Design brief:
part of a larger assembly, 6 chains, A: 162 residues, mainly alpha, B: 144 residues, Recoverin, domain 1, 2 domains, 2 strands, 3% strand, elongated, binds Rimtuzalcap, binds calcium ion, binds potassium ion, Small conductance calcium-activated potassium channel protein 2 (chain C), repeat (chains B, E, F), ubl conjugation (chains B, E, F)
Chain lengths: 162, 144, 272, 54, 144, 144
């Protein structure tokens, strides 16, 4: 006699919150029927939520045809970056030599700054080349391995005639 | 074409054309396609390199590259898809379709037409009247 | 043949930004006005009129920009797919989507002074309450739907999908460069940043919405506190459950339901 | 009006034809992964072993 | 090196030297490499064994194995990354780089230099005054 | 017997015959199976194409297809599992079962039968005193 759990919207809210395992708030069943229904809804939700999560996680994957284009898109890059990183090393290895063996007066600050930039350029060049190996490794282990197997089997069967 | 669009397709010709030489051969195309996980056969590679080459030299060049990269980039060729729709029912492998099968498929498979309409389609389709439709000149005369 | 083209992509790119600016201006003004109206000045003062006429004007220019961006898209469709008359591109789906966009972008608090009656039952005590609310709160909240323009601008400004060679290669393989492809690529390359940004952006918006909704039936400063609502949203997101703070109105309950539904998948994705 | 209506229907037919030929390759891609790859390996190994004694 | 480091070095040498012989051959190296999951070919194995072989024998001994193990453990050997940076732009598999290409890459790829500086670099780098600029020199000269 | 069933049967027949020759050979039967992921061998394919054929032609006929399809769609022919139950104990591969083995398996395996029942058997099962009781006739006499 308080219009709390006998309200359709209140019951809807209670079922929704118990389905998601959040828990009750100020609304709890007064009878055993409501408790049994809540138990059934919770048991069903404990598997329904996991199944829905798995489905929505699988729906966000790229297909093989899209992968074959994304690989080309990524390989179009990772080469401009490599060239840009490799040119800086060649620039600094010349700047240091110029400033240390060409000028009449040796300015130490410029030499120190260029020697500091040289290590950064070297580290960037070394870092940019790991992505290429990672991309190659992940682009591998994707071949069918069956069409070539059948082709080789047919060739060996033909060669069996000697 | 913008000069940026020319530096593009050139940064890609550099990818396809390894070891310089300004030429793309079957081996280079096979290597770059296998680097992506694909495993084309010899016939497929030959067909791919034939669909682009126009010199007859057997090698692809940048002018032979820009004439296709500037067309497949945009638009939607209807003449490249009407032919696919035609050859869906051509399982033999030739370039001919029998008139009886054409009439049957037009009058029994999807949004069926009337007998008079398909009869008119056949009568303006069989120019030679020999009972064997080519469906290629039928595309050239109609689409164009 | 690159003459008429490349002269419409730039126009669309500019129109998207000019629409985004006026879209965010109205949101900033509504937040400022709704925060200031609760004590600084009454609804009958001239400040409310001055701060609402600006929102009306911004809405007018936003609609004007949208109804031109769509025309530019139609022109691009005509250029790409060989056609002469523009009625070829007008189908049911396009008209329905245009009408939906106009309806979504044409909501704002109209200048004036109107009130209605609001009743609710207090939680944990079951005591009725009755206050005279304002009509502007009903129309102010739906203005958050203008956030798809950010996604549109980000999609149009991407440096990956805009490359011509990539488009040609993808057309050779017969694939579509729609929004789903971009979302999948972003999830493939940077899966954590997207989740972090989405969660952080949702947190403050949900907390502010709950605070704005539950301020008419709260004379104890429990759920009408920014730090008292952010905590509630955080504990509801993680499925721990409510403590001594539960919504007194249906708006808070709906917001909590949406936050819980989003969290039930966000947590699993982050864990993976 | 008939020409415009039929051109719209032609575009719709084209776009619905291009969509149905992607499932035909998704099915093949997902079905090609069921090969055992061991029986054929053993058969080829036996054949090469027999060919060794030329 | 201390005695303990020699002990770990001998223990590690024992893994490659499986059946004895006091020597590591190509077969032993291939077996130990493939036991870890790697799949090197014959050319790669020969290159690996050549990078360490000293007395033109084809087999690796402990005196020639102790070396390079105290060098690939500390420092960075910048003379090993400068050559890689040069090889980045040398796609022909040779030991020379074109002067015009070198000027272009130094001018229009990353932290662009001035025309006078690159001109001075080209003039100083060309000892023989020829278009085929060597890069083993200019790395064995400046990095003294 | 209805026209609809004939329609689905013809549609299914169209799958196997890739060409329009109206024939199913060892090539199509096996190309389809490898398209479905199966990996049949030559002997298995030969047996499958053999045990549907009627007019000793090697190629499979549409009436031959219908005869097998109209029977392999309903009911469970007991004469197909009785022979399998006989083959369970026929490890050698011939068509004969020794009387002693049959008596032993009937007396010791399953629910077991008394000595009198198995004595009535054999003497009734075997139509001769050879001792090499055939199981192919004890299906066409007892269960026919
Ligand atoms: C991911 C990738 C990279 C290249 N791809 C590709 N290239 C093709 N043609 C090339 C165009 C440049 C060329 F002319 F220099 C050589 C031939 C054709 C082709 N395909 C596959 C899809 O449907 C059949 C044709 N794919 N795909
Ligand atoms: Ca080449
Ligand atoms: Ca050519
Ligand atoms: Ca040895
Ligand atoms: Ca040696
Ligand atoms: Ca056939
Ligand atoms: Ca036959
Ligand atoms: K809980
Ligand atoms: K959980």
């Amino acid at each position: 006699q308080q219009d709390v759990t006998s309200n359709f919207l209140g019951a809807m809210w209670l079922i929704s919150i118990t389905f998601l395992s959040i828990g009750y708030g100020d609304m709890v069943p007064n009878t055993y029927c409501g408790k049994g229904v809540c138990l059934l809804t919770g048991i069903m939700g404990a598997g329904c939520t996991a199944l829905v999560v798995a489905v929505v996680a699988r729906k966000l994957e790229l297909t093989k045809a899209e992968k074959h284009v994304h690989n080309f898109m990524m390989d179009t890059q990772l080469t401009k970056r490599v060239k840009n990183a490799a040119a800086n090393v060649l620039r600094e290895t010349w700047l240091i030599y110029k400033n240390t063996k060409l000028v009449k007066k040796i300015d130490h600050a410029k030499v120190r700054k260029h020697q500091r930039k040289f290590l950064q350029a070297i580290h960037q060049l070394r870092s940019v080349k790991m992505e290429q190996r990672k991309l190659n490794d992940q682009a591998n282990t994707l071949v069918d391995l069956a069409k070539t197997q059948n082709i080789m089997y047919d060739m060996i069967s033909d060669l069996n005639e000697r | 074409l913008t000069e940026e669009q020319i530096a593009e397709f050139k940064e890609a010709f550099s990818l396809f054309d390894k070891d310089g030489d300004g030429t793309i051969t079957t081996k280079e195309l096979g290597t770059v396609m296998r680097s992506l996980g694909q495993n084309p056969t010899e016939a497929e590679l030959q067909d791919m390199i034939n669909e682009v080459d126009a010199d007859g030299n057997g090698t692809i060049d940048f002018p032979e590259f820009l004439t296709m990269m500037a067309r497949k980039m945009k638009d939607t060729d209807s003449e490249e898809e009407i032919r696919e729709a035609f050859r869906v029912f051509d399982k033999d492998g030739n370039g001919y379709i029998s008139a009886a099968e054409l009439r049957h498929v037009m009058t029994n498979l999807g949004e069926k037409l009337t007998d008079e309409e398909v009869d008119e389609m056949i009568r303006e389709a069989d120019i030679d009247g020999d009972g064997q439709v080519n469906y290629e000149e039928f595309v050239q005369m109609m689409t164009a | 043949k690159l003459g008429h083209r490349r002269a419409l992509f730039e126009k669309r790119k500019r129109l998207s930004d000019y629409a985004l600016i006026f879209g965010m201006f109205g949101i900033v003004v509504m937040v400022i006005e709704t925060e200031l109206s609760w004590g600084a000045y009454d609804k009958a003062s001239l400040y409310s009129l001055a701060l609402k006429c600006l929102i009306s004007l911004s809405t007018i220019i936003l609609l004007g920009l949208i109804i031109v961006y769509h025309a530019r898209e139609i022109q691009l469709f005509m250029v790409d797919n060989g056609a002469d008359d523009w009625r070829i591109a007008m189908t049911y789906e396009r008209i329905f989507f245009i009408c939906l966009e106009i309806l979504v972008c044409a909501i704002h608090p109209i200048p004036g002074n109107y009130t209605f009656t609001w009743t609710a039952r207090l939680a944990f005590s079951y005591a009725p309450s009755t206050t005279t609310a304002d009509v502007d709160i009903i129309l102010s909240i739906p203005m958050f739907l203008r956030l798809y323009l950010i996604a549109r601008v980000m999609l149009l400004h991407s440096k990956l999908f805009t490359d011509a060679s990539s488009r040609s290669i993808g057309a050779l393989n017969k694939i579509n460069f729609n929004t789903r492809f971009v979302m999948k690529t972003l999830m493939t390359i940077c899966p954590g940043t997207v989740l972090l940004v989405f969660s952080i952006s949702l947190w403050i918006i949900a907390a502010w919405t709950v605070r704005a909704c539950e301020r008419y039936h709260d004379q104890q400063d429990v759920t009408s506190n920014f730090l008292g609502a952010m905590w509630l949203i955080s504990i509801t997101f993680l499925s721990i459950g409510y403590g001594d703070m539960v919504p007194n109105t249906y708006c808070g309950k709906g917001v909590c339901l949406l936050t819980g539904i989003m969290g039930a998948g966000c947590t699993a994705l982050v864990v993976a």
